[PDB]
């Protein structure tokens, strides 16, 4: 049943399903009609003539209101529902929409379906932190230079793909209703084809919050005429559908994002990993340095082996380098009188008991080498023989050999 | 013909 | 049956990307109380908004045709009735690149022979059985194992022979040739090995280290390494040692050794005298150049 497990049961890359992260989520907007209730006018073009139909926006009445909840609700072509900004909030004044996902998402697109005509100037912003600092994502304007201080129709540079680009595309006043602006995060980016191996673009698609700012709106130039009321009431920002598409950032180690004990969206990490985005590795699995999963290689986090003598292991870069990029996990504070990186042998002054396996508690017996008999403390690990001096027959160098008598000298314990 | 007819180890690694 | 509400979100969605098409498969929603008239497939690069295909409720699978080769499409599935369109189900896929069928290769050149002329020049001669007009050109490649992880040097030739220049002396090289007519081209010919002629060394021995031996201070060991430009098989080494540097080679005592050994113990050395050292390499063609003297005093 598990997508992380293969047909035999081997590890494989895990990707969460493609979702519209915006759907059903609360969006904070700067303006909404109805408080106090004001009149708005819908403009419609047919042939060479323009027609205007004026309606009222009442926040209290459900059929007359246009709340920010109408951006994120289900989009129905038969019954469209759009949010509407306050009348005539033209440049310098702007209308912004902040969306908080509350987790790192690998954004593929950011789309907006408009009820009113598309803006003359719009910008998409993202947040790496959970709303502290903002970095631009994409700009849309007639004058990229004068409005957003970016080159107009700039081609995507290989040198900086992590930079927001400005275009005059999708800014046209026509269609006056139903206009769409869909931003493709990996569009035109030269190394987008090799995304799995490109961390530069992997960071570019990452966002925790999305902010869309409407800076300048399209106008006919009739607002400055004798009658300002009728004209200024027919210019506003209205959006029916806001879609932020993309998968949950889990670095290829999770198939789904689940809400935890503190009601926070987190990846359900696999391949022996842990973290909100599976960026780090589960304790006692530091045998290999952390690496993001690819299509060909699963890049699972390798478990430590201490032969059940140590509870904590640490990663050594030098040992990983000396192993030829194979393993670098060294066990910490080896118990039951054992030593070594993988805690596989008995420490100096101890020997292995052959009757019981290495995983057992009593795997290493004490090597009781005589202080005057034996030369050294460290003995034979497989047989349990102390390094005897003057050919001592003792197992722990305790008894003199045949014909040999015990001596007063500490250098020569037995004399023939 | 050209072949040999206990092995001792020697190691060297930097700090 | 039930048109009082908008259809429920579909249960499953599965894509299968091909070279120019995407096989889409789905399953209707779990709830049957709300009637469903059909399915709406929404595809496109980056966003699913590009194009929309509406199908009947009976349909369970659909292959999206006429697509770009290596593009990343986002497919969206909606369940629709008379009241409207339901909650969408999203999935993304990257189409497989357009594979071009490879041409049937040509016959490679035969009779490839390496003829060593000098220490830096080897001429390569090859034949062609295909030749009984054409604009076919031959390509030559060569590589030495030192330095490590180096690549083959390529050179184009229109005639049946090529003169290789800029080679190192006394070093084994591998040679092979290929024929290229156009989109059709033959693989590399049988590897022919050519070893360059030996030459007089052009570089002196590097890393000259002199140190006082612990035990018998009257004896001091000299350590040297072979030079980079050996230009052949080294047969011997000449060590020079004297108290004065300004004096010519004729004044300095000659101490030659064997080539297979890079160490030599010097016995009976004078006390409170500053010793200077110079080492040279021996070859079949000539002798290695002189090296810079090193300072070492005795107590
Ligand atoms: O000039 S009017 O007679 O249209 O005066 C405005 C009031 O008309 C409504 C009700 O329609 S009416 O009975 O024909 O007058 O208009 C609004 O609703 C209709 C649909 O009719 S229905 O009776 O509610 O079922 C919409 O028409 S249509 O788009 O379906 O063709 C109107 O849309 S529009 O003005 O043509 O763009 C719609 O008008 S509005 O967007 O609300 O302004 C009443 O509105 S209602 O309460 O929402 O139904 C108006 O009365 S009100 O007291 O000002 O609210
Ligand atoms: O018309 S505006 O008042 O909006 O100002 C025009 C400014 O655009 C430039 C370049 O802007 S910027 O590089 O982004 O700062 O026009 C010049 O560059 C663009 C882009 O270059 S390129 O050749 O396309 O790669 C050219 O546009 S385009 O042809 O590519 O579409 C301009 O050529 S053209 O007028 O469109 O035919 C090009 O103008 S020019 O041939 O260099 O004269 C700036 O011009 S520039 O400073 O002379 O390079 C203008 O900025 S300025 O401060 O008003 O000078
Ligand atoms: O040029 S090489 O093909 O030999 O590769 C060396 C480049 O690898 C980096 C980073 O690449 S990464 O590992 O993919 O993130 O350095 C690091 O990796 C190598 C492994 O190379 S190997 O051929 O597989 O063995 C380590 O070298 S080694 O100890 O295994 O010989 C590096 O160790 S060290 O810096 O030499 O001490 C290791 O560096 S580090 O632990 O990340 O610091 C690149 O180095 S980097 O730019 O400093 O990160 C190497 O690129 S380079 O252009 O050769 O400088
Ligand atoms: O339609 S067919 O009758 O021709 O059947 C083809 C089915 O085989 C797959 C899956 O094979 S499997 O995952 O090995 O079980 O084809 C793919 O086969 C391997 C994947 O191997 S791997 O071990 O999972 O890595 C890949 O080829 S290769 O690159 O290793 O040479 C291809 O997948 S991928 O491009 O890496 O994603 C793919 O081969 S295809 O190149 O010609 O065959 C299934 O294709 S798939 O849906 O695209 O993954 C086919 O399954 S199906 O049920 O018939 O649809
Ligand atoms: C419509 O607006 C008026 C403004 O005075 C308000 O009193 C009224 O309650 C609103 N309509 C509804 C149904 O709430
Ligand atoms: C239909 O559209 C109107 C627009 O004001 C909205 O009040 C209503 O809730 C919509 N109904 C559904 C089911 O979306
Ligand atoms: C929008 O207006 C606010 C002030 O209301 C300002 O801080 C911001 O810089 C303006 N521009 C954008 C693109 O948000
Ligand atoms: C050989 O000729 C081809 C075609 O002109 C060219 O692509 C290639 O680089 C040439 N190689 C050399 C070393 O001249
Ligand atoms: Ca809506």
Author numbering:
A (entry chain A): 38 to 453
B (entry chain C): 138 to 142, 159 to 168
C (entry chain B): 764 to 895, 901 to 1067
Structure paper excerpt:
Neogenin (NEO1) acts as an attractive guidance receptor when the Netrin-1 (NET1) ligand binds, but it mediates repulsion via repulsive guidance molecule (RGM) ligands. NEO1 is a single-pass transmembrane receptor belonging to the immunoglobulin (Ig) superfamily, composed of 4 N-terminal Ig-like domains, followed by 6 fibronectin type III-like domains, a single transmembrane helix, and an intracellular domain. Secreted netrins comprise an N-terminal laminin (LN) domain followed by three laminin epidermal growth factor-like repeats (LE1-3) and a C-terminal Netrin (NTR) domain. Structural studies on binary NET1-DCC and NET1-NEO1 complexes have identified the three NEO1 membrane-proximal FN domains as the NET1 binding sites (Finci et al., 2014; Xu et al., 2014).
